[PDB]
């Protein structure tokens, strides 16, 4: 069969690190395995434009493998033209780039799978790291050092411990719950969550969490807020000027979920005015972020409070190993005709939710 | 009585944040309390040279209050001139700036107290934060954003999770143990420690830690090493070229203990060569760090691997409130004549050691 694999070109970086599997040069580490299994692998980063390599191969591709770190948009037109398509895989987690609704509506027997669970620890670590970085005022401190300065009071005047703070998560699913688990031994004042379903009782008690019924009440009492929820109509633009005005004055806010959950200029204005002491995360809208995106240059009144990174938390080398292995497992389940997929990996099974 | 309080000058920063207690401008929040009790407080940052404000007041100071973040060196010579000195306090934790040996060996009736326990959480958080920053390659990632770049592969190629790593602490006292406690839910492969005495079985088991008998075998199996031990003859210069050559290749190293536990140029050479993937922490030797100290500009082969900060981890605003309250409590114990000090705060009591 013909498999089309769309990843970014890592360039010189791929030669520097053989465990950077999720790039066109290293091919998820499965190129030989695919060849030994008797299949033809087309690998490309060229995914935009009518004559892109991706579109040249869509008409007879049996399988397409994608990644949220360089997403091939599986659009209505591409689905129409993909006359042999049986399987779409996300080598990772996140299917925003696939028109799942259209696949479902067509009736076509296309399965869509992702490697569920493979990103969650990585993002949860990034959240807790960003919380510590912001609360403890690390960015300007390191900046002093590499600028050949030394002025402890300039850092200490806005540096706190995470101990004793009220910490709230919007969403307590796989990532959010793992964030709460990592926070327990830091002795927060309290861990709180809002979600559309309760944590099971034993899971709630394990982290000492208290559920809050509505988002305004949650943020109003939180020193630190973290967004760990899916993007949908209830969360798109949720973090806007009106809601930000209900946060505690000087709160710290982290978002590793989706950039569009925030209104970008409203977050920036809240950091400049002191409604927030700090903002960080690795998700942006639009993404990749333009050079002028307001979250690049925004700072608090002391010139700090910014712990943004590019979107990379879920593409550490340990996550990439999980993605590559999980992709191989999905592909084996398909090639053998067993279809013994892990239930949690299935997005669509032969077109059906 | 006359009290001499030696802190750093915070300048405009003290006006920006009234909770910055540990500076000359804000006087630990205790100036009006001391005045209302009829005492004379001299507050100064001027602690060096024979003409200093400190030395002007040494001869009739009853009490001297100090901080490790701007330490007045209470040397033999100053002690000898301090004809009325009865009490030395550390508004914080750390007594290396006080000649305790001389006080004890002479038998001079001088008590020395610190606010034990008030620094521990702050430093332990900073250790775990620094581990995450290094392992996850945060610093170059943030740099990309603020320089208006975006190149994920350049960050991802040296970014890992902390999960599944073997983490070792040199020292398992108050800070080291609270580092291990905070690491448990990150699902490390294993937590290890080296120390001169064992942790009790129950404390070991609570964090899943395994003791390794010597430092070479500890570091050789560790992906991450953290220093949480005092500076003494066993640790001075410990992290040197020879020991570093026994680290696991590409290890990450954190030191929030004392700068002189490392040989600075050897650590820099190991980061530049790839023996270490990253180094960080907030402690330096000399301290404050000179502008040319090698830990400022050192980097790994990718231009990263540096998570250094100035010495501030134990002077967060939450720590400063504990230090100010703890100083007030020690002073109240002294002024009332109760001497009802917290047992754990005593370093010397009227020149003598006391059972721990």
- The continuous run of DSSP H or E covering B4 comes out as strand B2-6
* B62 carries a ligand binding annotation: no
Put simply, the answer to whether A289 touches B122 (Cβ < 8 Å) is: no
Q: At what angle do helices A120-135 and A174-183 cross, to 10 degrees?
A: 50
Question: Across chain A, how many H-helices and E-strands are there?
Answer: 15, 13
How far is it between the farthest Cα atoms of chain A? 66
**Helix (H), strand (E) at residue B44:** strand B40-44
Q: Are B256 and B282 in contact (CB under 8 A)?
A: yes
Closest CA to A66 of A39, A96, A37: A96
Comparing C-alpha atoms, which of A166, A157, A123, A151 is closest to residue A137?
A157
A13 touches chain B (CB under 8 A): yes
Residue B337 among known ligand-binding residues: no
User: Encoding tokens for residue B285?
Assistant: 């030797």
Please give the structure tokens belonging to residue A53: 């390599």
B203 touches chain A (CB under 8 A): no
Catalytic residue among A240, A287, A329, A350: A287
Residue matched to tokens 């008690």:
A205
Measure the CA–CA gap between A97 and A296, rounded to whole angstroms: 25
Phi-psi region of B337 (alpha: psi -120 to 50; beta: other; left: phi over 0): left
Strand order in the sheet with B276-281: B209-211, B190-194, B166-170, B224-227, B251-255, B276-281, B306-308
Closest CA to A135 of A66, A186, A175, A97: A186
Q: How many CB atoms lie within 10 A of CB A324?
A: 22
| CA A155 to each of CA A243, B154, B268, B320: distance values in angstroms, whole numbers, following the listed order | 29, 29, 25, 13
Take residue B245 and report the two structure tokens written for it.
């050559």
Copy the structure tokens of residue B196. Answer: 């001169």
Which one of B120, B126, B153 makes the best mutation probe of the A interface by having the most chain A beta carbons within 10 Å?
B153
What dihedral angle (degrees, nearest 10) is formed by the CA atoms of A237, A240, A243, A246?
150
Are the beta carbons of A41 and A65 closer than 8 angstroms?
no
Buried b (16+ CB within 10 A) or exposed e, B195-215: beeebeeeebeebebeebeeb
Using what technique was this structure determined?
Answer: X-ray
* Number of helical H runs and strand E runs in chain B: 15, 13
List residues bridging with B112 in a β-sheet: B88, B348
Set A57, A178, A258, A277: catalytic member? A258
SS3 state of residue B33:
helix
Which candidate, A296, A269, A276, A277, places its Cα nearest to that of A137?
Answer: A277
Cite the beta strand spans of A174-333 per DSSP E. Answer: 190-194, 209-211, 224-227, 251-255, 276-281, 306-308
Pairing state between β A166-170 and A190-194: parallel
**Nearest beta carbon to residue A152 from set B148, B156, B312:** B312
Cβ-in-10-Å burial (0-12, 13-18, 19+) of B88 comes to buried
Q: Which residues contact A168 (CB under 8 A, 6 or more apart)?
A: A191, A192, A193, A194, A212, A218, A219, A221, A222, A224, A225, A226
Helix (H) or strand (E) holding B353: none
Residue given tokens 């925030």 in the structure block = A262
Residue B207 tokens, joined: 């964090």
Residue of A nearest to B163 (CA): A121
* Calpha distance B92→A75 (Å, rounded): 62
- Whole-number Å distance between alpha carbons of A132 and A159: 10
Count CB neighbours of A57 within 10 A.
18
3-state secondary structure B310-347: CCCHHHCHHHHHHHHHHHHHHHHHHHCCCCCCCHHHEE
> What is the DSSP code string of B52-119?
SHHHHHGGG-SEEEE-TTS---B-HHHHHH-TT--EEEESSS--TTB-HHHHHHHT---EEEE-TTSS
Distance between CA atoms of residues A150 and B22, nearest Å: 17
Buried b (16+ CB within 10 A) or exposed e, B110-124: bbbbbbbebbbbbbb
Give whole-number Cα distances, A137 to A87, A164, A218, B127, B310, in Å.
47, 16, 24, 14, 12
**Closest to B142 (Cα-Cα) out of A250, A182, A143:** A143
Q: How many CB pairs under 8 A join A and B?
A: 198
**Nearest residue of B to residue A307 by CA position?**
B142
B195 is in an annotated binding site: yes
**Residue ranges making up the domain that contains B195:** 119-308
The contacts of residue B49 (CB under 8 Å, 6+ apart) are: B55
B315 vs A152: CB contact, 8 Å cut-off?
yes
Would you say how long chain B is, in residues? 356
- For Cα atoms B314, B319, B322, give the angle at the middle one, nearest 5 degrees: 140
> Among this protein's residues, is A39 annotated catalytic?
no
Separation CA A56–CA B349 (nearest Å):
84
Cα separation, A224 vs A281, whole angstroms: 13
Kindly report the CATH number assigned to the domain that includes residue A150. Answer: 3.40.50.720
B191 is in an annotated binding site: no
Residues 6+ apart with CB under 8 A from B80: none
Record the tokens describing residue A151, joined without a space.
Answer: 């002025």
Chain A touched by B14 (CB under 8 Å)? yes
């Amino acid at each position: 069969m013909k498999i089309v694999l769309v990843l970014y070109d890592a360039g010189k970086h791929a030669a520097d690190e053989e465990k950077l599997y999720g790039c066109t040069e290293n091919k998820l580490g499965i190129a030989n395995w695919l060849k030994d299994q008797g299949h033809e692998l087309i690998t490309t980063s060229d995914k935009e434009g009518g004559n892109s390599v991706l579109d040249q191969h869509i008409p007879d591709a049996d399988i397409i493998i994608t990644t949220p770190f360089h997403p091939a948009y599986i659009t209505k037109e591409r689905i129409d033209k993909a006359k042999k398509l049986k399987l779409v895989v996300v080598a990772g987690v996140g299917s925003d780039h696939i028109d799942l609704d259209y696949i479902n509506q067509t009736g076509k027997k296309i399965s869509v799978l992702e490697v569920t669970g493979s990103n969650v620890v990585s993002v949860a670590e990034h959240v807790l790291m960003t919380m510590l970085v912001l609360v403890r005022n690390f960015v300007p401190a390191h900046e002093q050092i590499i600028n050949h300065d030394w002025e402890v009071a300039a850092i200490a005047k806005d540096a706190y411990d995470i101990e004793g703070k009220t910490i709230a998560t919007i969403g307590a699913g796989r990532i959010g719950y793992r964030v709460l688990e990592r926070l327990v031994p830091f002795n927060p004042k309290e861990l709180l969550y809002y979600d559309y379903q309760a944590l099971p009782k034993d899971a709630e008690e394990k982290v000492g969490a208290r559920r809050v019924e509505n988002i305004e009440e949650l943020v109003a009492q939180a020193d630190i807020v973290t967004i760990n929820a899916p993007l949908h109509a209830g969360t798109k633009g949720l973090i806007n000027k009106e809601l930000l005005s209900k946060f505690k004055k000087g709160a710290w806010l982290v978002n590793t979920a989706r950039g569009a959950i925030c209104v970008a200029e409203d977050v920036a204005a809240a950091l400049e005015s002191g409604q927030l002491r700090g903002y960080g995360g690795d998700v942006w809208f639009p993404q990749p972020a333009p050079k002028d995106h307001p979250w690049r240059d925004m700072r608090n009144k002391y010139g700090a409070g910014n712990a943004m990174t590019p979107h990379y938390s879920g593409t550490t080398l340990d996550a990439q190993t999980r993605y590559a292995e999980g992709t191989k497992n999905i592909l084996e389940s398909f090639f053998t005709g067993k279809f013994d997929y892990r239930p949690q990996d299935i997005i669509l099974l032969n077109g059906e939710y």
